Amino acid sequence: ASEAKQTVHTGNTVLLMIKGKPVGRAQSASGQREYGTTGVYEIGSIMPQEHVYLRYEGTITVERLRMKKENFADLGYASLGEEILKKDIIDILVVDNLTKQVIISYHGCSANNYNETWQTNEIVTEEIEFSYLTASDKART
């Protein structure tokens, strides 16, 4: 129940950072990976003798409520026009709120999809999809 004693990361305990700033009004974040695993089969038997890894695919999703200031478009972390070619890679960190310790990091993030919605009575929702080169979980120990 207490802040420190809870063994499980609630959404409250977690903080999301980009380039030395927190991301305000964040709502969701998902990370998916595929090692390109395959099975080896031969004439001798149907059963797969071994499994091997072929290709590494890594994507992370983020959703956000469009603030009147400090949006991804305003902040330059995301781009709309041809300016994207002038945007370098980005690194994302997911952080423990209590001590600012690191939980997991995404390296070499680059954008894939950018989505935006407006509606009569809902809050403006901003979504973006990032593809990255590697993901590492170090500096914890």
């Binding site: 950072m17 380039k19 030395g20 700033k21 927190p22 890679i89 690194d91 960190l93 952080v95 001590t99 600012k100 310790q101 690191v102 990091s105 390296h107 070499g108 590697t134 590492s136 170090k138 500096a139 914890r140």
Partner: protein, 156 residues
């Protein structure tokens, strides 16, 4: 890459030295130019890149290749660190985030192949107030210099 063993335009030289003279001269920490001829093909070559500093125990001090690459590396790393960290609040910064940044910087550096692989785990940090201290371990770029061969005739 080093200047070692690469050719030169020079038509002729005043002096040519013996192998022992080159060895003594090279070990003293002095650059020399050697003449090579084989199969009617003549060049003048840089024997080595060692500097005036004496101690071979410090390659970063003795040789140009280590120092030159090291000089640019620190210049690039220093600029990035100053921009990322200095103009930010201490409260949101900590040791762990610093450690991740370094690994990412060394990660992208390795992909470019400007360095050999590095022991990511060796990196560790301390933080106190407005001050922080960092230590890291990295391996250099080597270079193959000498070889040895032997011959045997078995009459068949």
């Amino acid at each position: 890459e080093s200047i070692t063993f690469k050719p030169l335009r020079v038509s002729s030289l005043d002096q040519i030295y013996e192998s022992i003279d080159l060895d003594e001269l090279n070990e003293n920490g002095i650059i020399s130019i050697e003449f090579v001829r084989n199969r009617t093909n003549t060049f003048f070559r840089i024997v080595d890149d060692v500097t005036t500093f004496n101690d071979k125990s410090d390659p970063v001090k003795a040789e140009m290749a280590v120092g030159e690459a090291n000089d640019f590396l620190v210049s690039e790393l220093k600029v990035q660190l100053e921009d990322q960290f200095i103009g930010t609040r201490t409260i949101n910064t900590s040791a762990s985030i610093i450690k991740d940044f370094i690994q990412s910087y060394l990660g992208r550096k390795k992909r470019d192949n400007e360095i050999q692989d590095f022991p990511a785990e060796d990196v560790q940090v301390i933080v106190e107030g407005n001050e922080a201290r960092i230590s890291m371990t990295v391996y250099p770029i080597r270079s193959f210099k000498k070889i040895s061969v032997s011959l045997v005739y078995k009459q068949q």
